[PDB]
Design a protein around this ligand. Structure first.
Ligand SMILES: *[C@@H]1O[C@H](CO)[C@@H](O)[C@H](O)[C@H]1NC(C)=O
Ligand SMILES: *[C@@H]1O[C@H](CO)[C@@H](O)[C@H](O)[C@H]1NC(C)=O
Ligand SMILES: *[C@@H]1O[C@H](CO)[C@@H](O)[C@H](O)[C@H]1NC(C)=O
Ligand SMILES: *[C@@H]1O[C@H](CO)[C@@H](O)[C@H](O)[C@H]1NC(C)=O
Ligand SMILES: *[C@@H]1O[C@H](CO)[C@@H](O)[C@H](O)[C@H]1NC(C)=O
Ligand SMILES: *[C@@H]1O[C@H](CO)[C@@H](O)[C@H](O)[C@H]1NC(C)=O
Lengths: 332, 338, 336, 337, 339
């Protein structure tokens, strides 16, 4: 007999779900917190990431106060019958696309109290856009956002506020490339003003993450370094190596030339330099500077006293050491 | 009471037929359109497409929707009842993939004014087909087209008009990765004619300009370094043939591999892109370096001949620099002024 | 009055039954078909289909729906009441996926005349599969087929026909990037028979041609210049052992890699393609120059001099000459 | 007045329930199934699937749908109200994805005979998973299966049987780019048994053959040719140390890339395959030849002796190309028989 | 007739309300879970995913749905009336996607016994996600997780349980191209605690082993080929050789390009995978060839008879040394990883 008795509140009394709580009065205040099950798939090419979230909106409805129907502290409404109440029209503004998750029953929770509060929880999978600053590529720090706003109701009716205790809770997520941080900005105001409609509420969370340098050192630097080190052995070799010194130089520069394009293949099409390009060009010059020193050795011999080689064995390794010192210190 | 007035205004008692347009057997209905752009980008040349995220606002005047009793000037209504009101039929001619947004609730806005004015806003994502001209690919300017028409109503019934001020409002800080969106927009009328009848249409054009930063550092400057390298052969002695030929064979082949890399992502089209002209002519310069060495080798067949070989070497040591310089000047100044 | 008329003759009171065809237990109805082509999509080669966006128009007669009190010629109805009218079933036989368009409302048009001539227009996108024959892959005229069928009714009920004037209309300014669409289109009757019964069908076919511009720049000219480069070995000194062996091997490798790249974007068909004739014949010419240098080395090494040079100087004229001979065969047969 | 006849049966006055199987608590229902292959293709080896378009049709008997007042042989009921009649819960067990075709109207057909026979035809596109056997990758025969099974009805209630004539039909003028479809098709019964119960299932198997008109030009012809180019080194003078070393190494390295290239478009399996065994033995051939010139130099330049150096070279000129053909006979005949 | 019994229960008369739950304001209801694996899909290493097709069976005892007039036990019902039962909520945490099928009809099975036990079977496809450790990439054992929770109910209402026998049943004849699925599977509990409350959860984990077949043919044997091929320098000629440089460089260069392909498919990771140490150590051996020659070349030019003797002496010592030191590396590398 204790099903029809509580459904009296919603239907038989005309609770009009097209009418805001506290109508013709103060705006409704929504307390929001998010839980991040899965963080991953940060793609530079299409400028977006994907995350799985548990949005939990909370408001206060004066009509639904459960007035002595039941004696419990909380009433666990089933995931169904969620189309007969008023809900905030929240939507993300950096959304590329999103979808619900329906496996077996719908993943929805409704948890009313005596005081008329509501604790709706909902599982979503959202693809969000993140602008990327890649001026310092190998040693990088990326900043991402999330923007929650109401499409249809203005600021004088709907106001979004972050919870006080724990607004964002991580779930032991670990990323393959990036090294996320445990501190989040989490505050913003973001309040909009569209031309002809008016104000609307927004509130945003900023996620600080940092890239790891392990892969690049083995993938990009260490092959490049040995190729430059490889060219030093030509100085010891006799100047009469007619078609031996010549490859030792030209095969090293084409290999670097073919390499540099492949290294910057995954990344987006960006005009600005990125400081991985500085290393590639500086190495390309040094490999090239190894080739030209042989050609001048050949020109002056065909006229001896060929001392150019005898000091070049000191200078070229020595100058490369100093360039390394400046580069590593600056980008740190 | 709030609930009763919604029913009373447009109900069985009211006798409002959602399937009858206002001003029946009279003047055609006026429509005013506003467009706001949230996101813009992801332009793909291969599919000749680009994706947008827009807010679309339509305004008209249905006389039967007047509400004298409530003194407030504007009334915001729930989107649940939004399907029970007459709304004009609109669609995009160059549309390919369009989706609604339902992340928590439908992204719709409905406002009714006392005099009967109706404001209706929709959040839509669009994929649109934009033809392009690739005559000068790294330095091109494209013109995207957006068309809004009426599918089933003649101008005897429905007429589309742009906003009097003009409403194509791009959002703040929309920084395209590869292009630079211009401020100026074009608003034109292009009435459609079919065998069924005539239909109304409005069209808005965007102007996009492509950046040149990436192409020079990825394609031009790497290609330049290959050409400049081949010059070492002239300095090298005339008797180390393994030495000279070895540089020559590598230079011409690798440039060809670099050459293919330019049109890898581009569409397959009959006409010749300007990027091809630069890469083709500089392919000639490296190719000539192979032919000249043979002539030095060929003439060497026997002290009068060995002087002539020296003559050809020295005259190419100066003239070949000059011709490369002249080519660069002509190529850059011609396209950039266009 | 507007409200009463809408539901007077398609309403419950009239008793129009939507589930019953016009002229039931009588002669079959004739549906007239028209099409407008808005966009004609890309013809993919690997997934073996193409795309199109069309307006489909059907015209027929229903004697039940007539009127005489209102003197207007037509009654432009709301496109959301189509569930109350009989709509002939139409079927695309060679489809792989079709969708409706619902960006706003649902993009449908209905119009009823005085006699009962119902006009019905829909916007439909289609993915259609058409077979293509690639024996002449660089240049070839191709045909793409489109079939309009009837899944449910037999000959005694539904008969499809084309429009008497202007069956197919093409939107002005339509231009394909990779192909040329010909002005003339073929309309044909292909009635289908199955063990269930006899079903009507009509067919429209388009002719397409290829640009030929892209391939000449892409692989024809790079292949040709590589062949020319190999011939410079003849005039280099015979004694220079590393130069000509290095020259021959590098020429071979650029051709064998370039040959495979061309076919990467095409289906793995079993007939040899016209492009493959060019790539193989050039590779044979490329490889032939290496053999000549092996001939002169053995003749020189053994222990005359006039004979060894004689084959080289004859070859200087011979190798260019044969290549031009091959071209005049290739460029007449395919382009005839 | 056709309208009254349409709802006289299946109406509330008829009381035709649609959740109660025909001949309830009696003999099981016998269904005859036919398939019509509208199109075939989209065979992907990497993910092991193929896409088919089929016209499925079923026939069963319902005694409650017995009408006699019209003398027509058959009645063409409208395809819209299929929701209120009994239809079997057929499904495909080995599939990966399926969908109905909605283009203008719901692609359904129904016809009712006088005695109560029901004919029901649908159009559906199937993606089906088939195991691949690539032990002899080019020369292989693959059998692709198609299982039709009932999900919720035990065999004491629903039994599936093939048609007695024309069980599987193929549309005219159907061909594949790479494979061919043999006209012989194998029909068998494979009853499934789970811990929940016993369920009926019928299997149809097609046989496919891989044509060679592509792998010959793509793989066999190029990598075969390079072995000829390795042999030319034996004519070169013994002192051309840059030349001889130069030719030897490249031909080895260039078809290491081609060997890796060969396997790019095929699944990543551990067991040795037919295309692999050809590349490796070719690689051993050219790699061995380069070790000869090292063996030629060391024995010759140590210091008459030239006779030994010439001996090693001249016997190779006949031995090296001859030993290819004796391998070539063995490999080609075994796979093709 | 059949019809009244279907209407009498589950019907407007004496209304069975789907919203309320079995044993309301009472002990938590028991749910027993069975899973059958129809097919195990492609494990795409790039995006940490593996597709699984399963039949999911849930058994529970609803006391209200009981009958005694029909003597037949476990009567079956049409899947078209499933909307009016209480069904327990269930979701997979590690999912990235899911779908039903709907091929001809609704692929759901409903069975009601006399006492009230209900069996409910659904065909579902899942794209789950697995954390992985690629410390030893060619020789590794991986763990795949299947995790089931309840979304809208706590442990005061709903508790999940594994089946006592045959909880997870692998279809006969299942085999994977690159993984062996061990028949030993471990079942364990992992309770979720969130700020809303505690929710019931069960976990089933599989172990997969990767075999070294494909990698030997594709990578190890070509890598072993080059270092042997580069060794030709020792006996190819005497000290006068431009060619000796030529062999060494092209072997060094192609080793680096082969390095790029090795991890090109694999996801980028900071840690040093066991596949890298094989290529990195082998990279030094081909790299060491040029350094040896330049030492040989330098000694030759320093002549201004004893100098030339040293040049040969270096070679002879190194001819025996390199096979010895390579053997040491070869035995140590393979033994430690297999163990
Ligand atoms: C229903 O709630 C009432 C209180 O209103 C309580 O007395 C009763 O025990 C509950 N259960 C039933 C079956 O009535
Ligand atoms: C304004 O910004 C503050 C940041 O502390 C935030 O807490 C608050 O909710 C914002 N106001 C609205 C209406 O969103
Ligand atoms: C609005 O529509 C009326 C229809 O009679 C027309 O006269 C008027 O010019 C329109 N207003 C415009 C186009 O601004
Ligand atoms: C049109 O329909 C009538 C009767 O329905 C039929 O007799 C006639 O053959 C059909 N075709 C033409 C071209 O009139
Ligand atoms: C189906 O076939 C079996 C034997 O093949 C037969 O016993 C049974 O009666 C048949 N079913 C019906 C409804 O006749
Ligand atoms: C469910 O199982 C638990 C564990 O045995 C038990 O404590 C509980 O009472 C069960 N729920 C019932 C019997 O409703």
């Amino acid at each position: 007999a204790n099903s029809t008795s509580n459904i009296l509140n919603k239907l038989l009394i005309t609770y009009d779900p097209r009418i805001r709580p506290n109508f013709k009065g103060i705006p409704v205040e929504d307390r929001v917190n998010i839980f991040i099950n899965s963080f991953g798939s940060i793609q530079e090419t299409t400028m977006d990431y994907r995350v799985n979230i548990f949005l939990r909106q909370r408001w206060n409805d004066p009509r639904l106060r459960l007035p002595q129907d039941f004696k419990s502290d909380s009433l666990t409404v089933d995931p169904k019958m969620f189309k007969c109440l008023w809900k905030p029209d929240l939507f993300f503004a950096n959304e590329k696309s999103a979808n619900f998750h329906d496996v077996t029953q719908e993943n929805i929770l409704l948890f009313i109290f005596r005081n008329g509060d509501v604790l709706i929880s909902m599982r979503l999978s959202v693809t969000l856009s993140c602008p990327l600053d890649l001026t310092l590529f190998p040693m990088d720090t990326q900043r991402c956002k999330m923007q929650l706003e109401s499409f249809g109701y203005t600021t004088d009716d709907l106001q979004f506020m972050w919870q006080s205790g724990d607004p964002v809770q991580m779930d032991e997520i670990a990323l393959p490339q990036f090294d996320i941080k445990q501190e989040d900005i989490e505050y913003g105001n973001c309040t909009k003003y569209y031309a002809g409609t008016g104000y609307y509420t927004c509130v945003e969370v900023i996620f600080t993450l940092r890239r790891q340098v392990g892969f690049y050192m083995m993938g990009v630097y260490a092959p490049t370094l040995l190729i430059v080190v490889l060219s030093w052995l030509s100085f010891w070799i006799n100047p009469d190596a007619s078609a031996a010194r010549v490859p030792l130089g030209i095969l090293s520069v084409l290999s670097l030339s073919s390499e540099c394009t492949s290294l910057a293949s995954e990344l987006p099409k960006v005009s600005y330099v990125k400081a991985i390009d500085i290393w590639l060009i500086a190495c390309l010059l040094f490999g090239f500077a190894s080739l030209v020193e042989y050609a001048v050795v050949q020109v002056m011999l065909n006229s001896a006293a060929k001392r150019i080689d005898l000091y070049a064995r000191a200078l070229f390794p020595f100058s490369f050491l100093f360039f390394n010192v400046i580069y590593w210190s600056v980008y740190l | 009471p709030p609930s009763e007035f919604l029913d009373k205004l447009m109900g069985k008692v009211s006798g409002y037929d959602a399937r009858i347009r206002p001003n029946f057997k009279g003047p055609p209905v006026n429509v005013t359109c506003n467009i706001f752009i949230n996101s813009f980008g992801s332009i793909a040349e291969t599919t000749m497409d680009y994706r947008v995220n827009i807010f679309l606002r339509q305004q008209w005047n249905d006389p039967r929707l007047a509400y004298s009793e409530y003194p407030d000037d504007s009334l915001d209504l729930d989107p649940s009842m939004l399907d029970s009101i007459w709304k004009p039929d609109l669609f995009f001619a160059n549309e390919k993939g369009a989706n609604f947004h339902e992340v928590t609730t439908d992204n719709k806005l409905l406002r009714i004014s006392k005099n009967g004015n109706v404001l209706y806003s929709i959040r839509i994502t669009l994929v649109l087909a934009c033809p392009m001209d690739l005559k000068n690919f790294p330095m091109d300017v494209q013109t995207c087209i957006m068309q809004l028409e009426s599918f089933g109503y003649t101008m005897n019934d429905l007429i589309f008009e742009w906003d009097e001020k003009g409403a194509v409002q791009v959002a703040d800080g929309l920084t395209l990765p590869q292009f630079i969106l211009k401020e100026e927009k074009d608003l034109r009328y292009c009435t459609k004619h079919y065998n069924t009848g005539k239909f109304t249409c409005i069209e808005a054009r965007f102007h996009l300009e492509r950046q040149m930063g990436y192409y020079l550092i990825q394609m031009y400057i790497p290609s330049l370094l290959i050409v400049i390298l081949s010059w070492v052969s002239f300095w090298i002695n005339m008797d180390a043939a393994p030495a000279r030929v070895g540089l020559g064979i590598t230079t011409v082949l690798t440039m060809t591999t670099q050459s293919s890399g330019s049109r890898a992502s581009l569409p397959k089209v009959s006409y010749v892109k300007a990027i091809d002209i630069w890469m083709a002519v500089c392919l000639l310069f490296v190719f000539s370096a192979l032919l000249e060495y043979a002539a030095v080798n060929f003439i060497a067949r026997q002290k009068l001949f060995i002087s002539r070989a020296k003559r050809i070497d020295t005259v190419s040591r100066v003239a070949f620099p000059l011709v490369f310089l002249i080519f660069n000047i002509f190529y850059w100044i011609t396209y950039k002024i266009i």
